[PDB]
């Protein structure tokens, strides 16, 4: 086609991220009247989403998938959205992202020094906690040989409740978890589903821990390229399909506890309180850390309302 264009993602090809990414391609495929194709370079075949953003400023990628957060890696107050328990739902990373000054600020940085147009935002589940052995409090966090990403909050996560975190690669969990290399890991339940990790866990608490949202995200040099039409035909299609993989999520929250019951899963729901209690000094080393920037993007964060 005249724009053969592409799309990676860590997800692989049975999760909600790919399947929305799917509708994306559909969409501007035909709105463009073929112009434009998207394929897709799932499984991190790519590389990671670290590596991937790096393809998007060069250019050499064109499509891909961030959350708010991971964006901490360039400007250091843009960990408060995976600060873990500080942002309390989806409504409140929406408005964080697009209805604060911090927000707009990041989004504005995003195009001018990371060469990437946000287009769409949705969301991506809330974090939970599976294991090979009961998660009935805080204390059986403890020495939990616990597998995170590659990312500062959720190592701070992992240490702050008393686990030890063990950062690995997506692709490389599954065989952790079975030959009980680690112990657990800490997905939304999506992921858990679409990983098969309830395959070989036995336990799943639900943490509650961090709100994962998803940017699609657009290489500036791939952008600007498009005719203004076709920039539009883009745009909407990203505002279709993150408007589809929010549902994905949200339906799926509801059924998939039972889901994982009738695999064999025993679900717990350790009490909240010291977990929170835990960061409360995570909260101060971050104010500490980033400064006047990150008290104010806190201020921000803690001010809005989460009922819609
Ligand atoms: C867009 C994207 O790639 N998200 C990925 C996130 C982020 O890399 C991480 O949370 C840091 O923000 O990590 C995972 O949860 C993980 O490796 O377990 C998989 C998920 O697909």
Redesign the pocket.
């Given at each position: 086609a005249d724009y053969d264009l592409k799309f990676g993602?860590?997800?692989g090809t049975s999760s909600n991220?790919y399947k929305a990414a799917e509708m994306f391609a559909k969409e501007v495929k035909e709105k463009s009247q073929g112009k434009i194709e998207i394929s897709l370079y799932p499984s991190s075949q790519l590389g990671?989403?670290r590596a991937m953003l790096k393809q998007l400023k060069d250019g050499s990628l064109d499509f891909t998938?961030?959350?708010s957060?991971?964006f901490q890696l360039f400007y250091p107050e843009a960990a408060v959205f995976?600060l873990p328990y500080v942002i309390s739902n989806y409504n409140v990373a929406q408005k964080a992202l697009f209805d604060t000054e911090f927000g707009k600020d990041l989004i504005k940085k995003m195009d001018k020094d990371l060469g990437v147009t946000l287009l769409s935002q949705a969301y991506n589940g809330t974090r939970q906690t599976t294991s090979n052995r009961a998660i009935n409090s805080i204390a059986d966090m403890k020495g939990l040989k616990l597998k995170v990403?590659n990312?500062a909050t959720?190592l701070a996560y992992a240490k702050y409740v008393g686990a030890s975190p063990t950062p690995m690669a997506?692709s490389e969990?599954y065989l952790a978890l079975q030959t009980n290399a680690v112990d657990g890991?800490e997905?939304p339940l999506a992921?858990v589903q679409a990983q098969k990790f309830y395959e070989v866990q036995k336990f799943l608490a639900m943490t509650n821990h961090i709100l994962?949202d998803?940017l699609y995200l657009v290489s500036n040099e791939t952008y600007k390229e498009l005719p203004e039409d076709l920039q539009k035909v883009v745009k909407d299609a990203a505002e279709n399909a993150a408007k589809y993989h929010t549902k994905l999520f949200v339906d799926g929250e509801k059924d998939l506890v039972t889901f994982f019951e009738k695999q064999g899963v025993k679900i717990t729901h350790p009490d909240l309180v010291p977990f929170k209690e835990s960061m409360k000094p995570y909260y101060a080393e971050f104010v500490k850390q980033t400064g006047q920037k990150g008290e104010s993007a806190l201020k921000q964060i803690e001010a809005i309302n989460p009922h819609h």
């Open positions: 993602m860590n997800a991220e990671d989403d998938f961030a959350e957060a991971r995976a990403p990312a959720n997506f969990v890991q997905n992921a994962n998803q």
